[PDB]
Amino acid sequence: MSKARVYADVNVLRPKEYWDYEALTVQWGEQDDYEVVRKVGRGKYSEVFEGINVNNNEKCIIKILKPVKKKKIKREIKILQNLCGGPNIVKLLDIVRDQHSKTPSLIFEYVNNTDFKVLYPTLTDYDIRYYIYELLKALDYCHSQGIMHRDVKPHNVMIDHELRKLRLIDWGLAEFYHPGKEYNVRVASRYFKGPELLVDLQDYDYSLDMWSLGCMFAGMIFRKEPFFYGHDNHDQLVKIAKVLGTDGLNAYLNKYRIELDPQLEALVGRHSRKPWLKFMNADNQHLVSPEAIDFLDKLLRYDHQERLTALEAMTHPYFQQVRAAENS
Ligand SMILES: CCN1CCN(c2nc(Nc3ccccc3)n3ncc(C#N)c3n2)CC1
Structure with a gap:
């Protein structure tokens, strides 16, 4: 033990x-609210870009996820939400998807x-x-x-x-x-x-x-x-x-x-x-x-x-x- x-x-x-994160019901925002400005990186799990929030015009980070299981994605979200406001914990700003492909993107602070x-x-x-x-x-x-x-x-x-x-x-x-x-x-x-x-x-x-x-x-x-x-x-x-x-x-x-x-x-x-x-x-x-x-x-x-x-x-x-x- x-x-x-x-x-x-x-x-x-x-x-x-x-x-109990598998009970999470994701609330999606509006994708158009965030536009790409330049790619800053990539990994086996996603492609990362410096984006911009059209509304407030503030800089943000757009993480375009690659095919992932619904369980794994509700885990990252549930955790992010759980830690929001914590000392030096990156803040999750929004969560959006592409209607056509359903491709999700997590919007974080820049x-x-x-x-x-x-x-x-x-x-x-x-x-x-x-x-x-x-x-x-x-x-x-x-x-x-x-x-x-x-x-x-x-x-x-x-x-x-x-x-x-x-x-x-x-x-x-x-x-x-x-x-x-x-x-x-x-x-x-x-x-x-x-x-x-x-x-x-x-x-x-x-x-x-x-x-x-x-x-x-x-x-x-x-x-x-x-x-x-x-x-x-x-x-x-x-x-x-x-x-x-x-x-x-x-x-x-x-x-x-x-x-x-x-x-x-x-x-x-x-x-x-x-x-x-x-x-x-x-x-x-x-x-x-x-x-x-x-x-x-x-x-x-x-x-x-x-x-x-x-x-x-x-x-x-x-x-x-x-x-x-x-x-x-
Ligand atoms: C280090 C590998 N890779 C780099 C890109 N990426 C990445 N990059 C940045 N900032 C950044 C801005 C300009 C140049 C480089 C980075 N951020 N900033 C917040 C998060 C978040 N959440 C994030 N993720 C994810 C990790």
């Missing part, structure tokens, strides 16, 4: 009105984002602490709302560096947390998939997002994106092993009576643990202080139960300057 150490009973105490590939390398020590902090506020909030994002990665963190505004986007994999429930482990992106997913542990929780966050954090301070560069689910676990070491992996597996798949256990092999400092270099030295290391260390743990919760992370001393600045 395995349950979240915090916010475990959020959905238990809330009525079906909150988490964020003048700067590609992480280019943005992150310019971030200062303080910028990093600041943005991670903002992102943590979003995670604690949704976790406190009985929700797991399940796909934390740079690509889903929009940042308007100019205005230092951050938003956690793409809640297309998010789920409501139910104690003991077994979820699909086919979530998140490879480079940010936690061990629980890599070893099929299905009764995972909010903590999976913290491993992802840790991956993002390590890449940022060590200036190595992505930090864990594997090519398939099995090789992802091998890269993780060559760093944290296999003893930790074994104890983890043993604690959860989990048996690895033969071929997989074959690839992993046996690896000593590599100190976090073995990743320091002239390119990232101005970013790897002990606090940054202590913090990273408490995020990237095999046992998801051992990882810091979002609330705990926000209070780590690494963020003290950000906290002191805010409380002013």
